[PDB]
Design a protein around this ligand. Structure first.
Ligand SMILES: O=c1nc(Nc2cccc(Cl)c2)oc2cc(Cl)oc(=O)c12
Ligand SMILES: O=c1nc(Nc2cccc(Cl)c2)oc2cc(Cl)oc(=O)c12
Lengths: 115, 115
């Protein structure tokens, strides 16, 4: 159901995406810039636990390829990225605190979606 | 695409839903128990700002009526509820702090989804 709102809402999503990637948030966004390299980090159970990896460079490639048909699809991916982090890591890990901070940035601006 | 996982994942979702409704979290979940009554609260702009209201009693009715076909649909509704709160209220409002606490409960247990 391609709504006329979809392109305008996808622009807002792209703006959020640019912000998450910006230096404003780099101190806590950086773990999510690129796909988790499980072997390089010694996390040999990561791909058994996480069945759908996601990261901001993948979200960016999808946006640039016009893969997302609506804001909801884009939001599901960004939230999947954070969920994977909450699934794999103990709740008191530093990367979890970073994920919650970035997700806070994401959720509050996603909530400002034009409609 | 009804996967064989969908009913088992929908059980996990129903467990999350029961937990969000439980007395364990009542001190911060209560604003989300029932649909926002905008007139009763004097929020005469609420339904201009919020185009898709959502609350836990609606999520519960949908679950009981077998409206959700998958965990993703259920998660989109719960997150919509929180997003509506972040959209309408100033970020330093008490209800926003409550929403973030409840959403924390939701996201960390949603991340434990069987798969
Ligand atoms: O989201 C994650 N991002 C990262 N980034 C990362 C961390 C250290 C070095 C480099 Cl090059 C990248 O690593 C993770 C490790 C674990 Cl255990 O879980 C995760 O969810 C993530
Ligand atoms: O989610 C919300 N839940 C509530 N509950 C609520 C608040 C006071 C009394 C009663 Cl009976 C219910 O009120 C809200 C007011 C505003 Cl401004 O925004 C909101 O998002 C919400």
């Amino acid at each position: 159901a391609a709504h006329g709102s979809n392109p305008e809402q996808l622009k807002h999503c792209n703006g959020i995406l640019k912000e998450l990637l910006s230096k404003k948030h780099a101190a806590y966004a950086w773990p999510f810039y690129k796909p988790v390299d499980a072997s390089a980090l010694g996390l040999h159970d990561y791909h058994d636990i996480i069945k759908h990896p996601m990261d901001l460079s993948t979200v960016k490639r999808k946006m640039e390829n016009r893969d997302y048909r609506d804001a909801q699809e884009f939001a599901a991916d960004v939230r999947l990225m954070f969920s994977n982090c909450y699934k794999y890591n103990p709740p008191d890990h530093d990367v979890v605190a970073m994920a919650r901070k970035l997700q806070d940035v994401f959720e509050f601006r996603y909530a400002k979606m034009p409609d």
